[PDB]
């Protein structure tokens, strides 16, 4: 009786898979049927999704079905191909081959879109659509893809915490009648604030006061043995132009002379003028440190610095600044540094009136002689058997002395170039501030930081106070301060800008 041949079925489309586009097309399939009693013209048949397709064997054993519905191949992923053959006698046989293929009607649409914005979705996969009736689908994150009258799909991208442990890739799958699915993957991108540069200005008033000569007198003291106060002499302290007692000495000399203080006024250099908002030397303070028998030294002394101030109509006003010194004539040991005597000046002040304007003269401290730019200190240290000399520096300020010239602001306001943009995350604060052009998140917000001419306190809410500490004589024309600040939003995005302060003199 007849002998069966070999039937084989080629791949169903190139990838042996029926996809969502092929679903709606007519698919040709093909194969071969050879051997046994198979012959050209033999019937080939197959049932796919309960539909019957047939053809005949052609020369070379090739068989081909012109058009099988993609929907049938999607519904039926495995089928037999059966060829019916006959031999000489007329005996029949059937030869069976098998075909399997995959079915995947899905398609992906992948997007990377900014949070907190509406976006038209472009380059969607071919055939993408909503099932009829549907005009909106809700995403995994609670976003929405909406179909508009213009045929465009719009995604409302939610705001996300891009710093936490939860993925910010949104998704949704649309399923259609015919079995197709479309998975839209929407990688939500983080938004950020935009810091905008800020401009502020401050002008330091530069008034000139007409003043008389200074008279400096040691007026009181606590403790001490053999204490004497006197007008300076060539041998003890040097001479000055008045009879006030600028010298004070104390102690029972254990080696030679008495310890003490001298103060030579600056009448000659001042030339009868004070300047507002300017560190001024009122004179030269000398500490004369000799060894004296233990216990014999003062522990404090007070000096009155008296002068008159003229107003704009030739009327003089007397002013007395009281200057207080704490003295430590330390026990002498075999350590020179430990044996130094220490003088500490208090930061006292006196307020006066001129032409109805109130001014305060305040002690700044001691400064090294001849160095107007030197550091000003309030304690000085003198070796035994030595004398040290320092300018006694004051500053005259406007008002009651509570503060220096200053200006205020908020770096989130429009300060010349517009207000800082906050982004979609919100919770924006200032997290760094620094003098200069470079800033990172740091530990200076809410602290006082030193600039070139003054100090800045910038707070996390953007509020700032800048006060000018430099003397008027140290502020060149066109002087400016630059402070860089860094803002940061809820999930770490940072932006920096510059607060520039024009520091002028008048």
């Amino acid at each position: 009786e007849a002998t069966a041949g070999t039937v084989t079925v080629n791949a169903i489309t190139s990838d042996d898979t029926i996809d969502g586009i092929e679903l709606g097309q007519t698919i040709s399939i093909s194969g071969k049927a050879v051997g046994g009693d198979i012959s050209v013209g033999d019937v080939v048949k197959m049932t796919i999704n309960n539909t019957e397709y047939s053809t005949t064997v052609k020369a070379g054993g090739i068989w081909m079905i012109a058009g099988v519905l993609g929907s049938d191949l999607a519904a039926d992923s495995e089928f037999d191909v059966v060829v019916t053959s006959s031999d000489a006698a007329g005996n029949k046989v059937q030869s069976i081959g098998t075909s399997t293929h995959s079915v995947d009607l899905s398609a992906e649409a992948n997007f990377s879109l900014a949070e907190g914005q509406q976006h038209v979705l472009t380059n969607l996969p071919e055939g993408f659509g909503f099932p009829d009736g549907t005009t909106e689908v809700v995403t995994n994150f609670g976003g929405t893809i909406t179909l508009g009258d213009d045929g465009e799909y719009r995604y409302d991208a939610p705001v996300r915490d891009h710093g936490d442990a939860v993925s910010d890739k949104d998704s949704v799958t649309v399923t259609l009648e015919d079995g197709r699915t479309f998975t839209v993957n929407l990688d939500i991108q983080d938004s950020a604030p935009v810091a905008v540069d800020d401009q502020d200005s401050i002008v330091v008033q530069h008034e000139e006061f007409e003043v008389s000569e200074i008279a400096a007198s040691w007026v009181s003291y606590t403790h001490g043995e053999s204490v004497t106060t006197f007008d300076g002499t060539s041998d003890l302290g040097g001479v000055d132009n008045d009879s006030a007692k600028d010298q004070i000495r104390w102690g029972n000399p254990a080696e030679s002379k008495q310890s003490g203080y001298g103060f030579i006024d600056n009448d000659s250099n001042l030339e009868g003028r004070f300047d507002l908002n300017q560190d001024i030397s009122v004179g030269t303070f000398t500490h004369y440190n000799y060894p004296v028998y233990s216990g014999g030294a003062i522990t404090s002394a007070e000096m009155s610095v008296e002068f008159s101030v003229l107003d704009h109509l030739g009327v003089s006003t007397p002013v007395t600044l009281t200057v207080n010194f704490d003295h430590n004539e330390t026990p002498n040991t075999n350590d020179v540094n430990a044996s130094r005597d220490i003088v500490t000046v208090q930061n006292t002040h006196v307020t006066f009136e001129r032409d109805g304007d109130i001014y305060t003269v305040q002690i700044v401290g001691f400064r090294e002689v001849g160095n107007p730019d030197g550091e000003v200190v309030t304690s000085i240290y003198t070796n035994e058997n030595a004398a040290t000399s320092y300018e006694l520096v004051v500053r005259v300020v406007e008002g009651d002395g509570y503060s220096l010239p200053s200006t205020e602001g908020n770096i989130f306001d429009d300060n010349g170039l517009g207000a800082d943009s906050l982004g979609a995350d919100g919770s924006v604060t200032v997290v760094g501030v620094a003098v200069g052009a470079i800033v990172s998140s740091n530990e200076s917000v809410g602290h006082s930081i030193e600039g070139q001419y003054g100090n800045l306190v910038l707070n996390s809410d953007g509020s700032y106070v800048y006060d000018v500490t430099a003397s008027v004589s140290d502020i060149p024309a066109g002087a400016t301060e630059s402070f860089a600040y860094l803002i940061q939003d809820q999930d770490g995005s940072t932006s920096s800008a510059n607060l520039s302060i024009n520091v002028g003199t008048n």
Partner: peptide
């Protein structure tokens, strides 16, 4: 000590 004995001196200051």
């Amino acid at each position: 000590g004995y001196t200051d």
